Amino acid sequence: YYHFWHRGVTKRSLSPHRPRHSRLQR
């Protein structure tokens, strides 16, 4: 998969977001 470059990496791009659900998203 190539989309993992931006998608699978979105984890670090989203980190700095609503820490509310971030616990279930991480």
Side-chain angles (χ1 to χ4, degrees):
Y1 248 113
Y2 16 77
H3 221 171
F4 243 52
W5 74 314
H6 250 248
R7 306 282 291 181
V9 183
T10 202
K11 121 178 169 180
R12 93 213 273 200
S13 160
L14 62 88
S15 5
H17 77 153
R18 272 195 190 75
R20 146 155 232 78
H21 64 159
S22 210
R23 284 170 303 169
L24 334 162
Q25 124 69 47
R26 238 257 202 81

mmCIF file of all heavy atoms in Angstrom:
data_model
loop_
_atom_site.group_PDB
_atom_site.id
_atom_site.type_symbol
_atom_site.label_atom_id
_atom_site.label_comp_id
_atom_site.label_asym_id
_atom_site.label_seq_id
_atom_site.Cartn_x
_atom_site.Cartn_y
_atom_site.Cartn_z
ATOM 1 N N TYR A 1 0.827 -1.201 0.000
ATOM 2 C CA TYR A 1 0.000 0.000 0.000
ATOM 3 C C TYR A 1 0.865 1.256 0.000
ATOM 4 O O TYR A 1 1.856 1.342 0.726
ATOM 5 C CB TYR A 1 -0.927 0.005 1.217
ATOM 6 C CG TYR A 1 -2.388 -0.168 0.866
ATOM 7 C CD1 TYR A 1 -3.080 -1.315 1.233
ATOM 8 C CD2 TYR A 1 -3.075 0.817 0.167
ATOM 9 C CE1 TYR A 1 -4.414 -1.477 0.913
ATOM 10 C CE2 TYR A 1 -4.410 0.663 -0.156
ATOM 11 C CZ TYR A 1 -5.075 -0.486 0.219
ATOM 12 O OH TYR A 1 -6.404 -0.642 -0.100
ATOM 13 N N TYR A 2 0.481 2.230 -0.818
ATOM 14 C CA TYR A 2 1.221 3.483 -0.915
ATOM 15 C C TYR A 2 0.544 4.580 -0.099
ATOM 16 O O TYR A 2 1.210 5.406 0.526
ATOM 17 C CB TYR A 2 1.339 3.918 -2.376
ATOM 18 C CG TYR A 2 0.374 3.208 -3.300
ATOM 19 C CD1 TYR A 2 -0.969 3.562 -3.338
ATOM 20 C CD2 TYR A 2 0.806 2.184 -4.133
ATOM 21 C CE1 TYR A 2 -1.854 2.916 -4.180
ATOM 22 C CE2 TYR A 2 -0.072 1.533 -4.979
ATOM 23 C CZ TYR A 2 -1.400 1.902 -4.998
ATOM 24 O OH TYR A 2 -2.279 1.257 -5.837
ATOM 25 N N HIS A 3 -0.785 4.581 -0.108
ATOM 26 C CA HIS A 3 -1.555 5.575 0.631
ATOM 27 C C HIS A 3 -1.107 5.634 2.088
ATOM 28 O O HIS A 3 -1.352 6.619 2.785
ATOM 29 C CB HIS A 3 -3.048 5.255 0.556
ATOM 30 C CG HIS A 3 -3.910 6.464 0.370
ATOM 31 N ND1 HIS A 3 -5.260 6.391 0.093
ATOM 32 C CD2 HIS A 3 -3.611 7.783 0.424
ATOM 33 C CE1 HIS A 3 -5.752 7.612 -0.017
ATOM 34 N NE2 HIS A 3 -4.772 8.475 0.181
ATOM 35 N N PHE A 4 -0.451 4.572 2.544
ATOM 36 C CA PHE A 4 0.029 4.502 3.919
ATOM 37 C C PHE A 4 1.028 5.619 4.205
ATOM 38 O O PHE A 4 1.333 5.914 5.361
ATOM 39 C CB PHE A 4 0.678 3.142 4.187
ATOM 40 C CG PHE A 4 -0.038 2.331 5.228
ATOM 41 C CD1 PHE A 4 -1.401 2.105 5.132
ATOM 42 C CD2 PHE A 4 0.653 1.795 6.304
ATOM 43 C CE1 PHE A 4 -2.064 1.358 6.089
ATOM 44 C CE2 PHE A 4 -0.004 1.047 7.263
ATOM 45 C CZ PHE A 4 -1.364 0.830 7.156
ATOM 46 N N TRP A 5 1.534 6.237 3.143
ATOM 47 C CA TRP A 5 2.499 7.322 3.279
ATOM 48 C C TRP A 5 1.856 8.546 3.922
ATOM 49 O O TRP A 5 2.495 9.261 4.694
ATOM 50 C CB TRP A 5 3.076 7.693 1.912
ATOM 51 C CG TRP A 5 2.118 8.462 1.052
ATOM 52 C CD1 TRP A 5 0.802 8.174 0.831
ATOM 53 C CD2 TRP A 5 2.404 9.645 0.298
ATOM 54 N NE1 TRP A 5 0.252 9.106 -0.015
ATOM 55 C CE2 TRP A 5 1.213 10.019 -0.356
ATOM 56 C CE3 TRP A 5 3.549 10.425 0.112
ATOM 57 C CZ2 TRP A 5 1.138 11.138 -1.182
ATOM 58 C CZ3 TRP A 5 3.472 11.535 -0.707
ATOM 59 C CH2 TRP A 5 2.274 11.884 -1.345
ATOM 60 N N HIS A 6 0.588 8.780 3.600
ATOM 61 C CA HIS A 6 -0.142 9.919 4.148
ATOM 62 C C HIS A 6 -1.228 9.453 5.114
ATOM 63 O O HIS A 6 -1.470 10.087 6.142
ATOM 64 C CB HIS A 6 -0.766 10.743 3.021
ATOM 65 C CG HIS A 6 -0.118 12.079 2.828
ATOM 66 N ND1 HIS A 6 -0.759 13.271 3.096
ATOM 67 C CD2 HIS A 6 1.120 12.409 2.394
ATOM 68 C CE1 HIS A 6 0.058 14.276 2.832
ATOM 69 N NE2 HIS A 6 1.204 13.780 2.405
ATOM 70 N N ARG A 7 -1.878 8.344 4.777
ATOM 71 C CA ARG A 7 -2.939 7.796 5.613
ATOM 72 C C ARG A 7 -2.365 7.185 6.888
ATOM 73 O O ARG A 7 -2.613 7.674 7.989
ATOM 74 C CB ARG A 7 -3.731 6.740 4.840
ATOM 75 C CG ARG A 7 -4.264 7.234 3.506
ATOM 76 C CD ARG A 7 -5.500 8.101 3.685
ATOM 77 N NE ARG A 7 -6.651 7.326 4.143
ATOM 78 C CZ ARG A 7 -7.851 7.851 4.359
ATOM 79 N NH1 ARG A 7 -8.058 9.145 4.160
ATOM 80 N NH2 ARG A 7 -8.849 7.081 4.776
ATOM 81 N N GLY A 8 -1.595 6.112 6.730
ATOM 82 C CA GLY A 8 -0.999 5.451 7.876
ATOM 83 C C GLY A 8 -0.134 6.386 8.699
ATOM 84 O O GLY A 8 0.143 6.119 9.868
ATOM 85 N N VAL A 9 0.297 7.484 8.086
ATOM 86 C CA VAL A 9 1.137 8.460 8.769
ATOM 87 C C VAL A 9 0.293 9.547 9.426
ATOM 88 O O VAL A 9 0.785 10.318 10.250
ATOM 89 C CB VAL A 9 2.134 9.120 7.797
ATOM 90 C CG1 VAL A 9 3.054 10.074 8.542
ATOM 91 C CG2 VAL A 9 2.938 8.059 7.059
ATOM 92 N N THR A 10 -0.984 9.601 9.058
ATOM 93 C CA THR A 10 -1.897 10.592 9.612
ATOM 94 C C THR A 10 -1.916 10.532 11.134
ATOM 95 O O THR A 10 -2.339 11.480 11.799
ATOM 96 C CB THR A 10 -3.330 10.392 9.084
ATOM 97 O OG1 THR A 10 -4.071 11.611 9.205
ATOM 98 C CG2 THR A 10 -4.039 9.284 9.848
ATOM 99 N N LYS A 11 -1.454 9.414 11.685
ATOM 100 C CA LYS A 11 -1.416 9.230 13.130
ATOM 101 C C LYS A 11 -0.636 10.357 13.801
ATOM 102 O O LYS A 11 -1.042 10.870 14.844
ATOM 103 C CB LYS A 11 -0.783 7.881 13.477
ATOM 104 C CG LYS A 11 0.454 7.996 14.352
ATOM 105 C CD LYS A 11 1.013 6.630 14.709
ATOM 106 C CE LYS A 11 2.384 6.740 15.357
ATOM 107 N NZ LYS A 11 2.944 5.404 15.702
ATOM 108 N N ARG A 12 0.483 10.738 13.195
ATOM 109 C CA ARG A 12 1.319 11.805 13.733
ATOM 110 C C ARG A 12 0.774 13.174 13.339
ATOM 111 O O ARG A 12 1.071 14.180 13.983
ATOM 112 C CB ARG A 12 2.758 11.654 13.237
ATOM 113 C CG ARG A 12 3.050 12.439 11.969
ATOM 114 C CD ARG A 12 4.059 11.719 11.088
ATOM 115 N NE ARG A 12 5.435 12.046 11.453
ATOM 116 C CZ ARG A 12 6.472 11.871 10.640
ATOM 117 N NH1 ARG A 12 6.290 11.376 9.425
ATOM 118 N NH2 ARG A 12 7.694 12.193 11.045
ATOM 119 N N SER A 13 -0.024 13.205 12.277
ATOM 120 C CA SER A 13 -0.607 14.451 11.794
ATOM 121 C C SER A 13 -1.895 14.774 12.543
ATOM 122 O O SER A 13 -2.359 15.915 12.541
ATOM 123 C CB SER A 13 -0.884 14.361 10.292
ATOM 124 O OG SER A 13 -1.839 15.329 9.890
ATOM 125 N N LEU A 14 -2.471 13.761 13.182
ATOM 126 C CA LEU A 14 -3.707 13.935 13.937
ATOM 127 C C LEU A 14 -3.421 14.063 15.430
ATOM 128 O O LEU A 14 -4.134 14.759 16.151
ATOM 129 C CB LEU A 14 -4.651 12.759 13.685
ATOM 130 C CG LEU A 14 -4.144 11.386 14.126
ATOM 131 C CD1 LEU A 14 -4.502 11.126 15.582
ATOM 132 C CD2 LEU A 14 -4.714 10.294 13.233
ATOM 133 N N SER A 15 -2.370 13.388 15.885
ATOM 134 C CA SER A 15 -1.991 13.423 17.293
ATOM 135 C C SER A 15 -2.396 14.749 17.931
ATOM 136 O O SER A 15 -3.157 14.794 18.897
ATOM 137 C CB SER A 15 -0.482 13.213 17.441
ATOM 138 O OG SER A 15 0.151 13.152 16.175
ATOM 139 N N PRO A 16 -1.875 15.854 17.378
ATOM 140 C CA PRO A 16 -2.169 17.201 17.877
ATOM 141 C C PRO A 16 -3.609 17.622 17.599
ATOM 142 O O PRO A 16 -3.854 18.641 16.953
ATOM 143 C CB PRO A 16 -1.193 18.088 17.099
ATOM 144 C CG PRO A 16 -0.908 17.330 15.848
ATOM 145 C CD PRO A 16 -0.961 15.875 16.225
ATOM 146 N N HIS A 17 -4.557 16.830 18.090
ATOM 147 C CA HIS A 17 -5.972 17.121 17.894
ATOM 148 C C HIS A 17 -6.771 16.800 19.154
ATOM 149 O O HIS A 17 -6.201 16.550 20.215
ATOM 150 C CB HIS A 17 -6.521 16.323 16.711
ATOM 151 C CG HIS A 17 -6.773 14.881 17.027
ATOM 152 N ND1 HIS A 17 -7.712 14.119 16.365
ATOM 153 C CD2 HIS A 17 -6.202 14.062 17.941
ATOM 154 C CE1 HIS A 17 -7.709 12.894 16.859
ATOM 155 N NE2 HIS A 17 -6.802 12.832 17.816
ATOM 156 N N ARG A 18 -8.094 16.812 19.028
ATOM 157 C CA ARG A 18 -8.972 16.524 20.156
ATOM 158 C C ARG A 18 -8.529 15.256 20.880
ATOM 159 O O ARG A 18 -8.722 14.139 20.399
ATOM 160 C CB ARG A 18 -10.418 16.375 19.680
ATOM 161 C CG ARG A 18 -11.186 17.686 19.645
ATOM 162 C CD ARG A 18 -12.684 17.450 19.536
ATOM 163 N NE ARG A 18 -13.414 18.685 19.258
ATOM 164 C CZ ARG A 18 -13.435 19.274 18.068
ATOM 165 N NH1 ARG A 18 -12.771 18.743 17.050
ATOM 166 N NH2 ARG A 18 -14.122 20.396 17.894
ATOM 167 N N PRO A 19 -7.921 15.430 22.062
ATOM 168 C CA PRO A 19 -7.438 14.311 22.877
ATOM 169 C C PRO A 19 -8.579 13.494 23.473
ATOM 170 O O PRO A 19 -8.349 12.501 24.164
ATOM 171 C CB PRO A 19 -6.638 14.999 23.985
ATOM 172 C CG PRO A 19 -7.226 16.363 24.087
ATOM 173 C CD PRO A 19 -7.658 16.733 22.695
ATOM 174 N N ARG A 20 -9.809 13.917 23.202
ATOM 175 C CA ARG A 20 -10.986 13.224 23.712
ATOM 176 C C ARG A 20 -11.052 11.797 23.175
ATOM 177 O O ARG A 20 -10.932 10.832 23.931
ATOM 178 C CB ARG A 20 -12.257 13.984 23.329
ATOM 179 C CG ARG A 20 -13.450 13.080 23.062
ATOM 180 C CD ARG A 20 -14.764 13.813 23.280
ATOM 181 N NE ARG A 20 -15.655 13.085 24.182
ATOM 182 C CZ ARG A 20 -15.509 13.068 25.501
ATOM 183 N NH1 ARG A 20 -14.514 13.735 26.072
ATOM 184 N NH2 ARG A 20 -16.359 12.383 26.255
ATOM 185 N N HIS A 21 -11.244 11.671 21.866
ATOM 186 C CA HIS A 21 -11.326 10.362 21.227
ATOM 187 C C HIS A 21 -9.940 9.862 20.834
ATOM 188 O O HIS A 21 -9.763 8.689 20.503
ATOM 189 C CB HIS A 21 -12.227 10.428 19.994
ATOM 190 C CG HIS A 21 -11.694 11.315 18.910
ATOM 191 N ND1 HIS A 21 -12.093 11.217 17.595
ATOM 192 C CD2 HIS A 21 -10.791 12.321 18.955
ATOM 193 C CE1 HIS A 21 -11.456 12.124 16.875
ATOM 194 N NE2 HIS A 21 -10.661 12.808 17.677
ATOM 195 N N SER A 22 -8.960 10.759 20.871
ATOM 196 C CA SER A 22 -7.590 10.409 20.513
ATOM 197 C C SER A 22 -7.139 9.153 21.253
ATOM 198 O O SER A 22 -6.243 8.441 20.799
ATOM 199 C CB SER A 22 -6.646 11.569 20.833
ATOM 200 O OG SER A 22 -5.543 11.590 19.943
ATOM 201 N N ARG A 23 -7.768 8.887 22.393
ATOM 202 C CA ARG A 23 -7.431 7.718 23.197
ATOM 203 C C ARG A 23 -7.899 6.436 22.513
ATOM 204 O O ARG A 23 -7.311 5.369 22.701
ATOM 205 C CB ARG A 23 -8.064 7.828 24.584
ATOM 206 C CG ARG A 23 -7.337 8.790 25.510
ATOM 207 C CD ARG A 23 -8.130 9.045 26.783
ATOM 208 N NE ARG A 23 -9.468 9.555 26.501
ATOM 209 C CZ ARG A 23 -10.423 9.664 27.420
ATOM 210 N NH1 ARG A 23 -10.186 9.300 28.672
ATOM 211 N NH2 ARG A 23 -11.616 10.139 27.085
ATOM 212 N N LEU A 24 -8.959 6.547 21.720
ATOM 213 C CA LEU A 24 -9.506 5.397 21.009
ATOM 214 C C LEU A 24 -9.015 5.366 19.565
ATOM 215 O O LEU A 24 -9.149 4.356 18.876
ATOM 216 C CB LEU A 24 -11.035 5.435 21.038
ATOM 217 C CG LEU A 24 -11.665 6.179 22.216
ATOM 218 C CD1 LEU A 24 -13.117 6.519 21.917
ATOM 219 C CD2 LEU A 24 -11.561 5.350 23.488
ATOM 220 N N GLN A 25 -8.444 6.479 19.115
ATOM 221 C CA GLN A 25 -7.931 6.579 17.753
ATOM 222 C C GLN A 25 -6.475 6.129 17.686
ATOM 223 O O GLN A 25 -6.061 5.476 16.729
ATOM 224 C CB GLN A 25 -8.059 8.013 17.242
ATOM 225 C CG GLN A 25 -6.742 8.613 16.776
ATOM 226 C CD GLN A 25 -6.223 7.968 15.506
ATOM 227 O OE1 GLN A 25 -6.967 7.778 14.544
ATOM 228 N NE2 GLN A 25 -4.939 7.627 15.497
ATOM 229 N N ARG A 26 -5.703 6.485 18.708
ATOM 230 C CA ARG A 26 -4.293 6.120 18.764
ATOM 231 C C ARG A 26 -4.110 4.621 18.544
ATOM 232 O O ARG A 26 -3.129 4.032 18.998
ATOM 233 C CB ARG A 26 -3.692 6.525 20.111
ATOM 234 C CG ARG A 26 -2.501 7.462 19.989
ATOM 235 C CD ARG A 26 -1.189 6.728 20.217
ATOM 236 N NE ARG A 26 -0.116 7.637 20.612
ATOM 237 C CZ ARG A 26 0.050 8.082 21.853
ATOM 238 N NH1 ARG A 26 -0.782 7.705 22.813
ATOM 239 N NH2 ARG A 26 1.052 8.907 22.134
#
